[PDB]
Amino acid sequence: HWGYGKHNGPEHWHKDFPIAKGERQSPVDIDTHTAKYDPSLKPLSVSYDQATSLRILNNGHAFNVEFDDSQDKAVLKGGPLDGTYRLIQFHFHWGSLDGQGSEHTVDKKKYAAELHLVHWNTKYGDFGKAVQQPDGLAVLGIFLKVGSAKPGLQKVVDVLDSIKTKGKSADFTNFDPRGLLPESLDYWTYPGSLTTPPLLECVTWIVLKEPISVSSEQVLKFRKLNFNGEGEPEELMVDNWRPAQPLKNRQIKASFK
Ligand SMILES: CC(=O)O[C@@H]1[C@@H](O)[C@@H](O)O[C@H](COS(N)(=O)=O)[C@H]1OC(C)=O
Ligand SMILES: [Zn+2]
Prior knowledge:
Blueprint: E1 29-30, E2 36-37, E3 44-47, E4 53-58, E5 63-67, E6 75-78, E7 85-94, E8 105-106, E9 113-121, H1 127-130, E10 137-146, H2 154-159, E11 169-171, E12 187-192, E13 203-208, E14 212-214, H3 216-222, E15 253-254
Parallel strand pairs: 1-8, 2-15, 10-13, 10-14
Antiparallel strand pairs: 3-6, 4-5, 4-11, 5-7, 6-7, 7-9, 9-10, 12-13, 12-15
The structure holds 3,4-di-O-acetyl-6-O-sulfamoyl-alpha-D-glucopyranose and zinc ion.
Family: Belongs to the alpha-carbonic anhydrase family.
Domain Alpha-carbonic anhydrase: 1-256
Pfam family, one: Carb_anhydrase
């Protein structure tokens, strides 16, 4: 099926998923001098105090830390968002080298990786229904640069050995996503899509201005994961990012000057 290699990668997706060439695809390049400051944007509210993590899973495309979303335990509100969006999982995209890995770019600059915290609009009742709506999801995107270690990331790094290959999962309770946030919540926002098949155009993207720093040793451990399942030839899980798509008829708004 689909992947990130020469023969099944982003260039090929449109054949099974024609929406790949659609009206509001992600990610995009964020041209910082074209984005418009919008004073009508309310403050962004990230309420992760009661967050309940459950499990970490290698699905062959990335790894996901999954959350109990049966109640309003961890929610995103405010900013460009109307209503309440519940945290369902977070995952990362990263590169084979420190100079690439992010999905969004900032004035064409690629970061070593990108963290995505996926939330769904509670008005639609469940995640499956939400992805069929133009305002069904809100994904908070955070850039990673290589520098000093991120303490809040280490617990994730430590468990990757136990989910090396496709299909593996491990218990991952009591993880606090607040430890992955930068100091500032300044952001850009635009309407877009999922960055993997089925590429549904259901996402309000909120991308933070301030990157978090992770150590080279930390990102190196991401690159030791496998796309393949156990007992198959090793294909390192690296460069699992879609490149920037055309902005087309969209405007990127900024929460800051
Ligand atoms: C659970 C799962 O497969 O999560 C996916 C995940 O593991 C990854 O490949 O990234 C995908 C796209 O999400 S993104 N980049 O925020 O648009 C995910 O799809 C979905 C639907 O969340
Ligand atoms: Zn993602």
